[PDB]
Amino acid sequence: EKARFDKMLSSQEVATLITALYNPDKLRYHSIIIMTDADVDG
DNA sequence: TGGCCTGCAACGCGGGCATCCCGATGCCGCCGGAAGCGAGAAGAATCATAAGCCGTAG
Numbered sequence: 001e002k003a004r005f006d007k008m009l010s011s012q013e014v015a016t017l018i019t020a021l022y023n024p025d026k027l028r029y030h031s032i033i034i035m036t037d038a039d040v041d042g
Numbered sequence: 043t044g045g046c047c048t049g050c051a052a053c054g055c056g057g058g059c060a061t062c063c064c065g066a067t068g069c070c071g072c073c074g075g076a077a078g079c080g081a082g083a084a085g086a087a088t089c090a091t092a093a094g095c096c097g098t099a100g
Contacts, residue, residue: 003092003093039100041099041100042100
């Protein structure tokens with residue numbers, strides 16, 4: 001929301017690897033889990 | 043200390059009255075020249091959009 005741009009991209013690895021970016025075709029990795037540290041930055 | 047203002051008597055000519063000629067003027071017919079209103083075009087300006095640095099944090 002702070003900077004919305006369809007061209008702005010740095011990694012793009014997550015969306016490229018989970019789906020094709022639209023998603024009903026490729027539904028690979030139906031189960032995802034996000035492990036994160038217990039600090040405030042986590 | 044020097045010059046402006048004014049009373050006064052003598053010289054001077056202009057105001058007042060009469061009048062015919064002249065030039066402006068109102069009127070009428072006729073010709074012309076900005077105008078101004080709307081409309082189209084150009085330049086000037088203030089609001090709205092994308093960071094950059096400051097210093098820690100990942």
